[PDB]
Amino acid sequence: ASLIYRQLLTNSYTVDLSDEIQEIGSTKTQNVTINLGPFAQTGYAPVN
Amino acid sequence: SITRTRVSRLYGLPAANPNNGKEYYEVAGRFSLISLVPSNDDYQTPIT
């Protein structure tokens, strides 16, 4: 009855395929580059 | 001054013929414009 384990590990390559299938219908959410940093403090020129 | 009249030797540019035949008065030079504009510094794009 140990074969199950040996099979579970042996056939585990097919897991990849399943993931691909589960990724087929999954929605895609792609991120963009985000500015951070020393953002200089700029204001209005002397105004009267 | 206007002929056949006592109104003469006045300083200015009357509206009678400011064109003076010339089709355009030209002034050339440099102009510097310090402004604020929309730039992300190519840093708002997709990651890929």
What are the contacts of A11-20 at 24+ separation with CB within 8 A? Answer: none
Work out whether the CA dihedral A34, A38, A43, A45 comes out positive or negative: negative
Which member of B36, B41, B46 has the closest CB to residue A30? Answer: B46
Is residue B43 a contact partner of residue A29, using CB atoms and an 8 Å limit? no
B48 touches chain A (CB under 8 A): yes
CA pair distance A24, A20, nearest whole angstrom:
6
- Technique used: cryo-EM
Calculate the alpha carbon distances from A13 to A20, A23, B1 in Å.
12, 16, 104
Which of B35, B43, B13 has the alpha carbon at shortest distance from B25?
A: B13
Which chain A residues are Cβ-neighbours of B44 within 8 angstroms?
Answer: 32-33, 35
DSSP summary character for residue B20: T
A31 touches chain B (CB under 8 A): yes
The structure was resolved to a resolution in Å of 2.9
